Amino acid sequence: TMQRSSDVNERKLHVPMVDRTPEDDPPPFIVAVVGPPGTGKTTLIRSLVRRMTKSTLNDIQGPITVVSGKHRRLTFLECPADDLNAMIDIAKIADLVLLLIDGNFGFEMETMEFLNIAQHHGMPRVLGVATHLDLFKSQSTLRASKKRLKHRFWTEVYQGAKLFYLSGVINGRYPDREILNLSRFISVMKFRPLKWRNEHPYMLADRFTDLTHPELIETQGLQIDRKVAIYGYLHGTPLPSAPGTRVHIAGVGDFSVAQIEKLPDPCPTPFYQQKLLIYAPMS
Amino acid sequence: SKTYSTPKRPYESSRLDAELKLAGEFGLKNKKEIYRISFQLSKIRRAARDLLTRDEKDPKRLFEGNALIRRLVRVGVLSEDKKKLDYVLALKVEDFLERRLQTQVYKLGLAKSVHHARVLITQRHIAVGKQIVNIPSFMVRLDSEKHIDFAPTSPFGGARPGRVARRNAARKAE
Amino acid sequence: GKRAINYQILKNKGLTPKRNKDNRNSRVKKRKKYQKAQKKLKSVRAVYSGGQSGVYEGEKTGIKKGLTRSVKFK
Amino acid sequence: SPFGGSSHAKGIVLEKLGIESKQPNSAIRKCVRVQLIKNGKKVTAFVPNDGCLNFVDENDEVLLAGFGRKGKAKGDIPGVRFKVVKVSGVSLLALWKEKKEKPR
Amino acid sequence: TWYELQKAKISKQLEINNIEYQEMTPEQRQRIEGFKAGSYVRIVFEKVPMEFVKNFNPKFPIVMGGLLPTEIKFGIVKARLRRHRWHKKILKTNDPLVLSLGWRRFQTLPIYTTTDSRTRTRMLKYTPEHTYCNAAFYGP
Amino acid sequence: LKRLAAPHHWLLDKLSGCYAPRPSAGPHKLRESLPLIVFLRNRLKYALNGREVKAILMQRHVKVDGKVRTDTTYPAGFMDVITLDATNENFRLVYDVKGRFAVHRITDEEASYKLGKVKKVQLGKKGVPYVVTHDGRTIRYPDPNIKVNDTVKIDLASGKITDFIKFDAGKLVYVTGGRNLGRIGTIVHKERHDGGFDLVHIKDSLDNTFVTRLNNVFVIGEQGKPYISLPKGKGIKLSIAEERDRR
Amino acid sequence: AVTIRTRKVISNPLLARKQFVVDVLHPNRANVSKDELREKLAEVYKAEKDAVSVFGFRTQFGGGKSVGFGLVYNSVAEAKKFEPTYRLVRYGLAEKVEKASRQQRKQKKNRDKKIFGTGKRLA
RNA sequence: AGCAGGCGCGCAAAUUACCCAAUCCUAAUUCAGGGAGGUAGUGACAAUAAAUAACGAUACAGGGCCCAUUCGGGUCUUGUAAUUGGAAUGAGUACAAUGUAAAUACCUUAACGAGGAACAAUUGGAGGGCAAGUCUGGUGCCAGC
């Protein structure tokens, strides 16, 4: 089997790429719950935060940064399922995508458009979550829908991807066994380098304040192009600290930075580096 | 197991016309059916060649040849008069696959074509005495050749008429 | 007001030649190949087709004088 | 055997060889310069169907295989021993018949 | 082999980069390389328009990417294009469409062209039905 | 719990799980005994599954050669009796023409005793002569004309000896073990090497002069008058081809 | 109309049962409805409808007949004492369901092996 | 130091399921237990069985069919038409029963379930032909890609 021994170690050899993800303060890997309207997202977010920090979250909004495991943390984002103007830049920023399908309906064209946008703009780690298995007692049809969805999904994304199935919701949160065997996977995540997120300094905003003078807006009369503080969390290549950098935030057009400032970290490092925990802003 | 075997060459003109004639004559599905019947024919007459090449009056040749001809007359591919061992050597694939249930119910009648025979006995209508057989490749034994009739729980026998007939009776009696 | 996916995106095929309803079921294609080749060799031999069916209406298709389809012994 | 023992080798495309060939679907148009990774060398691969040449652009981590002509053609060049069978994870036959989608 | 040679090259580059980064803090953290990765930072922008803060919604994400020195200039750009194979209708030239070219997303008017056997670039009145073609448009 | 290659004269079903029963320590060896699980589960089929066999063993219905022996894996091997008090049954398990454990339905007056070959005659303690037998019933005070490789007739109410068959040239014999199993008749030749490989040769209705190891043979009684009954025509193995030629 | 027919009947006073093979023949119906079968078998024998048991059914191919195994006891108390619990809960006479199934039972077993203490627990 | 799930590079395949019901085994010992073991899920590695259609009726058409290095040979008993008709079904779907430790599957089975039977079979391979179109060569109107 020397031919197989020389033929299966060609899986290793790829294009050499560079990473720039330093091993001292790795960012929360932004994952992005996206899919159809209605099904999934908010209850899956509530289940993941209830199993990762043992505390519920009612009326969630905006990006959370929860902690999972010892070293590193991660970031959730309920992307709205009605606009490509959020779907596109979520697929441009995201690193994992736990992607919702509903098995009593087949696929849906919002997750179709999301998977095509991801396939073009640079493949994140995709992971399918097939929810809504209120199908019937006919476990033959349950196995049939899961089999056809798995084969269609493995054609659409890489063949062999994980497709976690969820049953019905037990009073707001998902079945905790399935949330356990999903959370163990996204703790053993193992991401990959991509050229766009290793060539551009990119940041997801999670707090948004307007430090413009109230007397000034009250004497100008709702006309000014104000000044705005984005309290956020950068990923990727180092955003250069000198003010004057052109930074485009999405959906309004570009600006230049005025001043930036490093803050106390609102998420855990290891406690030995502390000496020598869900953080849910915009809420 | 590995019943069927690929022949000594599968891309050849005479073999291609062989499979074309046999398939279109006995109403067959693919080359695997001819290859299965041809294989087991080759196996039993390869076993018959050794019993021929050893001498007569050996107990091996005597009652193993009697065993082989009893099994072959039980399947029915050997006539009642040629009960000696070299007619097994002179066997052929045509009167060996002629005893399958498709061809046999077409010969018995009741089907009006070989292909209609195949599609009805896979639509579960023909029962050898008591047992409904829904498979063509049966090789029906000689004793149960006269027990072929439409099964009683099927509307070509004497059951309730089918769903097409009673649905048309409903929406033509409305 | 809920979307769905259509047939070609569900099946994920496309840009193929027009294939054949005869080519679908192999038992049918190995029937419509035989009964053509059954009618092909009414043009290389003259096969037996029952015989004198009606009354003898003549040979009905032409007899020619200068033609001998008899294999001769060298 | 043509490259050590393996039947397929992942490779990095340098540049589409012969974009300026005027005759469409020609031999000098359907070549790419692949950097073989298993020993780090250059080779000239032969992607079929110039209409599906333009999937591969530049370091698309392409996967080669042998060619093996079953006769003699009209204006085919010799020397190309390698054809493209898979590009960046997917198979470009499936890409050219537009089932899958090229990921980037 | 060659791939482990290239990986050893870039990883030794990153290692010597870190080993001469691990130095005095005002230069080597925030004025020679500037907030590497994973730093909760506040940014301010003046001249941000009103409707952003007037009707900001907490549901929608606010991503922000920096620009390289080349991707603030304007002018034409020549891309390759293809009708996405499940779109039921083909793309006529001078019909505007939204693009996710990089960070910016923008409606622009393209012109689909093709090199007629690679001698000149003439304007098509329609995109081809299943294969690629060149295209040119004003944009970032 | 090592199994699935049992002694294949037990004839257990192979699609019956994976394992096969381990006979415990007892009066007979491993591969020449037959435990009551294999007996009452797939040899005469009075109980379906092994825990039901444990139920009929625990409920005192079965006794092997006199006393109850409430145990599943009890290796009740050759020549003993099994007096099922209900069903009035006396299973003596003996051998057959082919190598299996044939059963009987013994009368009570014959099931009241059993026999067996001795293995040694010794002087145990305080100058007491005691003999053994093949099923471990080391019994004291024999008649001292008991020789090695001879049979005594145990009374099975007490452990006393009622009679013995002093084997010599010419008294009716059984066999056990080896490829000449289940044969009778003792009168052709009596060979005695030095180190085994010897037999009292056999004479039957067809007078087949046969031999085996002397460890693989033991006695029954007088010619034509045996002490034990024997199953299915007092097993001979003439020929199945001659049987299908005659009848 | 169906029929039942028993064969291979052997008495067995080692359990005071009679065990046999049951052939039910139904010309058009699906299958023979084990509760109704059980009361019919206890009617044709002299049994209880509680001391008769049938388990190993299989409908043979093409429909029409079904073959299975069949038990009739006597002394309904002895039927309780001899037939296993899964059969005795398939009939409605004795129930057994416990919540600590495998995982929440064995984790409780291992932690209770770790406990070593009774209800004296003051902190 | 085994089961399940992982890691083993950035590009890859089973579940962190059920259970002592079977076979055995251990213990004071029928009764407790056993990731020994069994059951189920996933599973184009392999193997066997075979459904995607079957039978009729009608209409015109013949400058038409088919075969053999060529001229020859033989044939409406040859093709195109929803012109069109009713019959039979299981893939499914599903009361129920069956199986089983319980449950799935199969085996049964009432009521549904077919015309483009769209209830949509693929993978290859050999040829063409078409423009107010494109390109290269030249001994016009051509040859090639």
Ligand SMILES: Nc1nc2c(ncn2[C@@H]2O[C@H](COP(=O)(O)OP(=O)(O)OP(=O)(O)O)[C@@H](O)[C@H]2O)c(=O)[nH]1
């Ligand atoms: N029966 C059943 N209901 C579900 C299941 N999953 C979600 N639902 C229902 O779907 C409803 C919507 O919940 P979410 O999915 O959290 O709503 P959302 O994520 O905010 O989606 P949007 O409102 O469109 O943004 C819930 O109230 C659930 O009752 C499921 O698996 N089974």
Ligand SMILES: [Mg+2]
């Ligand atoms: Mg929501």
